[PDB]
Amino acid sequence: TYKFVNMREPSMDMKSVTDRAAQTLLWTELVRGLGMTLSYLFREPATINYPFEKGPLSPRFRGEHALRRYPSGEERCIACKLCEAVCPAQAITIEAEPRADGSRRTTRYDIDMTKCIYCGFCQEACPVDAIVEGPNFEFSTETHEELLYNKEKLLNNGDKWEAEIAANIQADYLYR
Amino acid sequence: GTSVKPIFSRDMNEAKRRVRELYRAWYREVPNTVHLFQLDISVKQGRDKVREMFMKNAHVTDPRVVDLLVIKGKMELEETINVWKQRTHIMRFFHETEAPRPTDFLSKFYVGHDP
Amino acid sequence: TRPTIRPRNDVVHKQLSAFGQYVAEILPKYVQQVQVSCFNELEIFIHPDGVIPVLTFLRDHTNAQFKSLADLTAVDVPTRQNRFEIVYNLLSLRFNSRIRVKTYTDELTPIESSVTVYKAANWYEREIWDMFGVFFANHPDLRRILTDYGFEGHPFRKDFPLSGYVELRYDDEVKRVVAEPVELAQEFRKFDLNSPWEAFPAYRQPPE
Amino acid sequence: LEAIKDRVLYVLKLYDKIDPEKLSVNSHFMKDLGLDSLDQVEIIMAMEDEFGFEIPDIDAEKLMCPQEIVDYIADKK
Amino acid sequence: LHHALIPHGKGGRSSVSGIVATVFGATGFLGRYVVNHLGRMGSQVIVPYRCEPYDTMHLRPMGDLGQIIFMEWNGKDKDSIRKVVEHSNVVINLVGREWETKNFDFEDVFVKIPHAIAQVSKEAGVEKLIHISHLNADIKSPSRYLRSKAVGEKEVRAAFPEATIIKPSDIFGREDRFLNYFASMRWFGGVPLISLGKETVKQPVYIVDVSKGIINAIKDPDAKGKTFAFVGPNRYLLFDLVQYIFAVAYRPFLPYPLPHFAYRWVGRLFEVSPFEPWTTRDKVERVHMSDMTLPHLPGLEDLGIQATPLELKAIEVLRRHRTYRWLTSEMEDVKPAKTVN
Amino acid sequence: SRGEYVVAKLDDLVNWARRSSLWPMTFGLACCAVEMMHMAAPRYDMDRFGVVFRASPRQSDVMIVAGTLTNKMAPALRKVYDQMPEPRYVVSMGSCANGGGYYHYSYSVVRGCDRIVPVDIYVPGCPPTAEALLYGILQLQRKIKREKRLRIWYRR
Amino acid sequence: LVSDGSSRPYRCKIKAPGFAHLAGLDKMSKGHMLADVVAIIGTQDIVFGEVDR
Ligand SMILES: CCCCCCCCCCCCCCCCC[C@@H](O)O[C@H](CO[C@H](O)CCCCCCCCCCCCCCC)COP(=O)(O)OCC[N+](C)(C)C
Ligand SMILES: NC(=O)C1=CN([C@@H]2O[C@H](COP(=O)(O)OP(=O)(O)OC[C@H]3O[C@@H](n4cnc5c(N)ncnc54)[C@H](OP(=O)(O)O)[C@@H]3O)[C@@H](O)[C@H]2O)C=CC1
Ligand SMILES: *P(=O)(O)OCC(C)(C)[C@H](O)C(=O)NCCC(=O)NCCSC(=O)CCCCCCCCCCCCC
Ligand code: SF4
Ligand code: SF4
Ligand code: SF4
C-alpha cells in the first residue's frame, strides 16, 4: 500500500480563509516553533559530566586488545595464527618457535593499532580465548609508535585488565 | 582480428596529424600554466618537458595506441586548463624530490641487488 | 522440508527462460547466448556492436520496459582474448523484473556510449574508463572520476598491483606534496588459501 | 615581400636549434637543417606569433622551406 | 659494520641507509633542510632541542616511524651531549646565533658549544663529525661573529682531528636571513648602504646545495678530515645584488650611502630588542664585508654538487615579498644582475 | 626570581586561554566524522569544554583529521592546515588517519596523515567512540598546559 | 558479486544509490542559486563513502 504526504487541499470557506490570513499576518506557526524551543529550554539536558560520569557499555564491547593467561600463569596463546589468518586488516604479525620446555609459544606477537579496524574477528577465531578485545578505550597516545603494540605490551594489558576481561567473558560466554 | 576496428584516424597519417594538433595545444598552454599555477620553472623548461613527454612515446607504430595516447593527452590538458590540478601534480611531472638513480653497472652493484 | 537450503522458483525460472527465448528470437543479429541462472537471474551475451540497439529495445519495447539502469560495470579476465567484460544490469518496474546484458571488449576496441539510452551511463562509463581503460566512443565528457589527478594506470585491472606504483607525502624542501615510488614498511603478505581438494563436482571441467 | 622575408628570417634566427650560419631562404628544415616534425611545428607556431594569423595543420605541413613560408604568407597577405 | 647498520632498500622513505646522525641545531633553517634530506634518504635522526617541543613539530613528517627521535639537551651540559651522541655514528653541528642573548654569546655558541660537542663525540666513538663554520672566518676579522667562528673552528679541529669543516658563504632560501633581510628594508624608506654597496662582493650559496653537500660529505669516504668551502657560481657587487633583489620583489629601489659609524649606531639601536633583533652591529659588519676567495679549499663541485645560480631560485624567496599587483609575474620577467667575475 | 616568576605566571595565563578555548575546524572525512557529530551532540557536549567548531581555517585552532586521507585529498588537507594560523594543533582520529586503517595497502590512501601534517594527538579506534575522542581532546588540553613558551624565551 | 569457485570473491561491484543521485545533481540545479544547491545536496542525502568506495 501507499499514502500521500502532500495531497491535501484547503477549504475555501470564509472562516478558514480568515484563519489563514491571520496565520500569515500574525506568525502563528513561528510562535509555535518558539514555544517548542522554550519547552526544550525548560527541559532537563541529557549531558553527562564526563569524565566523572561515563557512558553505558556492554560486556560485548570491543576496546583495547589483550593477551590472556590461564589461572596457572601460563600464556593461553598457542601460536596457531588463526587470528593472523582471519584478520581483515592484516594488523597481526606472529612468529613462533619451540620454547625451552617444548611448548608451542610465540616469540613475536605484534598488533598494529593504527591498522586494526577493531572488528573482533581475532577473539572469535581464537580457540583458547587468548587474544581478547578488552573494555579499555581511553588509550590515545601523543606519538605514532606507541600504537604499534607487541607481545610485551599486550601481555601487560592482559595483566592490567584481567579481572574485568574475565568478568565480561563470564557474563557473555553463553552467547558465543 | 585482421580487420581491427579503428578508434579513428584510420592509418598512421591522421594519427600523426592528431599528435601534432595536441602538441600545438600543449605548446600554446605552457605560458598560461606557468602564470596561473605560479610555477617557479621557466617557460622553456615547461616546453622541454612537454617535448620530452611526447618523445617517450615516439616508438609507437599502432594507430589505435596513438589515438588512445592523444585522447589521454587531451584529458591531461583539460585537467591543466581548468585548474583542476594543483601545483602539486604539475611539479609531479618533474620528479623534483627523487635522488638521481644510478644507471651504471658498477653503481648498481654497489648500492644493492637491483638489476 | 530442508531448512538450510534455499527454495527454488520454477515459475520465475520458466518466465525468465521464455523471455530470453523471446528476445533471442527478436534480435538474432546480436544475441550470441542466453542463460538463466538457477537463482532466477536472466543473462544475455550479445555482440559488442549491438549495445545501443539491444539497450534501446529493452528500454522502449512494450513487453520489455527496462526503464532503470541499475548498474554498469566491467570484469577483467586476462586469460581471454577480449579481457574486459562490460555488464549492464537493468530493472523493469512495469513487469517487476531484472535483466543482465554482457558484452566483451579489449584494450584498444571502443564500446559505443549508451548515454542516449540511460543518463546514468555517463558516470558509470566514466568510472569504467577510469578503472579499466575501456574507451567509450560517443561520451559527452569522458575523464577520470575516482583516481587522483594525473594518475597513471587503471587500478581495477587484474595486472595492476594492489598498492600501485607511487605514494604521496609532504616534502618540506619544496613546500608541497610529492609523489614518490611506493615503499612499504611492512609488505602485504600473500596467502595461498585454496584447498587442493575439489569442492564442487557439479562445476568440474573436462581435463582436455 | 622583402619585409616578409626579413621577418621570417628574424624569426628563424631566434630558434635555438636553427643554425644561423647555414640558415638560408632555401634551406629545407628536414634535410638541410636536420630537424624533425616537432621542430617544424614549433617554427610554424612562431611564424603564427609574428604575423598573427592562423595556419591550418594541412597548410602547416606545406611550409618546409623559408621560401615556401614567405610565399604562403604573401598569398594570404 | 654492525648488521643493523648495513644499508638496505632503494634509498626511499622506508629504507635503511646505515646513517645514525645526531643533528645539533636541527630546529633551524639549515638544520631543518639537513634533517629533511636525512629522513628522505631513510636514516636514523636524533634531534637535540632546547626550545619548546612545539617549535620542533615541522621535523616530525620528515622521517618514517621511529627514525626521528627528539631528546632534550642543554648546550653547557656534557652529560646531555653524551646522552644524545651515545648511539650515533655521525654528528652534525649547526648551532649558531646571529645575535648575542643574555646567557649565550658568540664565544658560547661558536667556541664553547662546538668544542664540547667535538670533544664529547670523540669520547663516545662517533665515526664522523661535520661542523658548520663561516667562509669569512678570520681570526683578526672586525666581526666578533667571525672571530669566534675561527677560534671555534680551531678548537673543533683540535678536539676531533677527523672532522669535516664546511664554510658556506651566505645561505639563501625561504626561511633565510640574507634575502629576507635585504628585502625587508622597504619599511625603513630607502636602502642604507655603506659606500653605496660599491666596495662589497658576495657570492651567496643555495640552501639545498648546502644540505646536499653536507649529506654527500657523510657518504664520501675520503672527506674525513677536510675543510670545504661552499660558495655560489656568481659573484655580485652588493649594490647589484640588492638592486636585483628589489627588482625581483617588484619594490621601488631607493639606495643611499650611509657612513659606517652611523650605520653602526643604527645597528646598536636595533639590538636592544629582547626578542630576535632585526639587525645588529655584527650583522652590519658582515654585510659590509666582502666574501673571501679560497681557491685551495674544495667545494660543491668536489663533493659532486653543481651550485645552483641565484637567478633560478630567487623567485622562491622573493615572491612572498611582492604585492597582489606583481604576485603572478614570471621568473623570466626580471633580467639577471650584473656579475663580477 | 622576579623575572622567572612573572614569565611563569604569564605562561600559565596564556596556556589557560588556549587550553580552554579550542576552536576545531569543521573538517571531517569518512565514517570517523560521525563520532565528532555525536561528540557535539547533547550526550557528550563539546561546547561545555570550550570546544567550538568554526568553518574558516583562519579562525580555527585544532584540525581533527577524522577519517581516511586519500591521495586525491592530501593536497587540500595540507592547504587548509597551512592556511590555519599558529598556534595550531592536530588530532588524528581513527585507524585511517593514524596509519592506513582498513585501507593501508591501497593505491589511493595515505598511510597516515602524519606523512602530510605534524600530528599532536592520535586517537585509536574504528571509529573511536565519542568518549574516546573527548578523552583525546582533554589529553590535548593537558598537553597544551605543559607548554612553556615564555619560560623558554626568558632562559634563551 | 562474481565468484570463481574459490573462497575469495573474484569481482565485487557495489552499486550505491548516491552515485546516480550525485550524477543527476547538475540537472536538478538548473536555474537555482547557491543556497538552493545546498538544499538539493541535502535532499539528495549523499554519503561519499558509498559514492566513491
Ligand atoms: C585586559 C588584559 C587581559 C586580561 C587578562 C587578566 C584577566 C583574567 C584573569 C585570568 C582569568 C582566570 C584565570 C584562572 C582560571 C581559574 C579556573 C580554574 O578552574 O583553573 C584551575 C587553575 O588554573 C590554571 O591551572 C592556572 C593558570 C591560570 C591562572 C594563571 C595565574 C594568574 C596569571 C595572572 C592573572 C592576572 C593577569 C595579570 C597580568 C595581565 C585549574 O583548571 P584546569 O586544570 O585547567 O581544568 C581541569 C578541568 N576540570 C576543572 C574539570 C578539572
Ligand atoms: N645562515 C647563514 O647565512 C649562514 C650560517 N652559517 C652557520 O650555519 C649554522 C646554521 O645556521 P642557521 O640555520 O642559518 O641559523 P639558525 O639561527 O636558524 O639555527 C641555529 C640553530 O642552533 C640552535 N641554537 C642556537 N643557540 C643555541 C644554544 N645556545 N644552545 C643550543 N642550541 C642553540 C637553534 O635552536 P633554537 O630554536 O632553540 O634557538 C637552531 O636550531 C650556524 O652555525 C651558522 O653560523 C654559516 C654561514 C652562513
Ligand atoms: P616527425 O613527425 O618525424 O616526428 C614526430 C614524432 C616525434 C612525434 C614521432 O616521430 C612520431 O610521430 N611517432 C609516432 C608515434 C606517436 O604518435 N608518438 C606520439 C604519441 S602522442 C603522446 O605521447 C602524447 C602524450 C601526452 C603529452 C604529455 C603531456 C605532458 C605535459 C607536461 C607539461 C609540463 C608542465 C608545464
Ligand atoms: S579486531 Fe579485527 S582488524 Fe583488529 S586485530 Fe582483530 S581481527 Fe584484526
Ligand atoms: S588465534 Fe589465539 S591461539 Fe591462535 S595465534 Fe591467535 S592469539 Fe594465539
Ligand atoms: S578508522 Fe574506521 S571508522 Fe574511521 S574512517 Fe577509517 S574505516 Fe571509517
Report on the structure:
Chain D: Carrier of the growing fatty acid chain in fatty acid biosynthesis. Chain D: This is Acyl carrier protein. Chain D: It is found in: Mitochondrion. The structure is cut from a larger assembly and holds 7 protein chains of 7 kinds. Chain B is mainly α. Chain B has helices at residues 12-27, 30-37, 43-55, 63-81, 87-92, 105-111. Chain C has 208 residues and is an alpha+beta fold. Chain C has 3 helices and 7 strands. Chain C has a 5-stranded mixed beta sheet, with helices on one face. Chain C starts with 9 loop residues before the first helix and ends in a 27-residue tail after the last strand. Chain E contains 11 helices and 13 strands. In chain E, strands 3-2-1-4-5-6-11 form a 7-stranded parallel beta sheet, with helices on both faces. A two-stranded parallel sheet of chain E has the order 7-10. A two-stranded parallel ribbon of chain E has the order 8-13. The chains are: A alpha+beta (176), B mainly alpha (115), C alpha+beta (208), D mainly alpha (77), E alpha/beta (341), F mainly alpha (156), G mainly alpha (53). At the A-F interface, loops of A face strand 3 and helix 5 of F. Bound molecules: ligand PLX, NADPH dihydro-nicotinamide-adenine-dinucleotide phosphate, ligand ZMP and iron/sulfur cluster (SF4) (3 copies). NADPH dihydro-nicotinamide-adenine-dinucleotide phosphate is lined by residues 25-31, 50-51, 55, 75, 94-97, 104, 109, 132, 134, 168, 170-171, 177-178 of chain E.
Quick description:
The structure is cut from a larger assembly and holds seven protein chains of seven kinds. With 77 residues, chain D is an all-alpha fold. Chain D contains four helices and no strands.
Attribute tags:
part of a larger assembly, 7 chains, E: 341 residues, alpha/beta, 7-stranded parallel β-sheet, two-stranded parallel sheet, 11 helices, 14% strand, globular, G: 53 residues, mainly alpha, 0% strand, rod-shaped, binds ligand PLX, binds NADPH dihydro-nicotinamide-adenine-dinucleotide phosphate, binds ligand ZMP, binds iron/sulfur cluster, membrane protein, Metformin, electron transport chain, Respirasome
Layout: helices, strands, pairs:
The structure is cut from a larger assembly and holds seven protein chains of seven kinds.
Chain C: H1 10-26, E1 31-37, E2 41-46, H2 51-60, E3 68-76, E4 84-92, E5 97-105, H3 121-132, E6 166-171, E7 176-181
Parallel strand pairs in C: 2-5
Antiparallel strand pairs in C: 1-2, 3-4, 4-5, 6-7
Chain D: H1 2-14, H2 37-51, H3 57-60, H4 66-76
Chain F: H1 2-20, H2 32-40, E1 62-66, H3 74-83, E2 89-93, H4 94-98, E3 121-123, H5 130-145, H6 149-154
Helix pairs in contact in F: 1-5, 2-5
Bound molecules: ligand PLX, NADPH dihydro-nicotinamide-adenine-dinucleotide phosphate (NDP), the ligand *P(=O)(O)OCC(C)(C)[C@H](O)C(=O)NCCC(=O)NCCSC(=O)CCCCCCCCCCCCC and iron/sulfur cluster (SF4) (3 copies).
Tally of individual helices of chain B: 6
Main β sheet profile of chain C: 5 strands, mixed
Q: Approximately what portion of the residues of chain B adopt beta-strand conformation?
A: under 5%
Adjacency order of strands in the biggest sheet of chain C: 1-2-5-4-3
Give the count of structural domains of chain B: 1
For the termini of chain B, the CA-CA separation is 37 Å
Small molecules held by this entry: ligand PLX, NADPH dihydro-nicotinamide-adenine-dinucleotide phosphate, the ligand *P(=O)(O)OCC(C)(C)[C@H](O)C(=O)NCCC(=O)NCCSC(=O)CCCCCCCCCCCCC, iron/sulfur cluster
* SSE pattern of chain C: HEEHEEEHEE
Topology, number of strands of chain C: 7
Helix content of chain C: 10-25%
The assigned structural class of chain B equals mainly alpha
Class derived from helix and strand content of chain C: alpha+beta
* Rg measurement of chain C, Å: 22 Å
Give the terminus-to-terminus CA distance of chain C: 40 Å
Please bin the fraction of helical residues of chain B: 55-70%
Largest binding interface between chains: A-F, 30 and 34 residues
Number of strands of chain B: 0
Globular, elongated, flat, extended or rod-shaped: what is the shape of chain C?
globular
Overall radius of gyration of chain B: 18 Å
- The protein's oligomeric status is part of a larger assembly
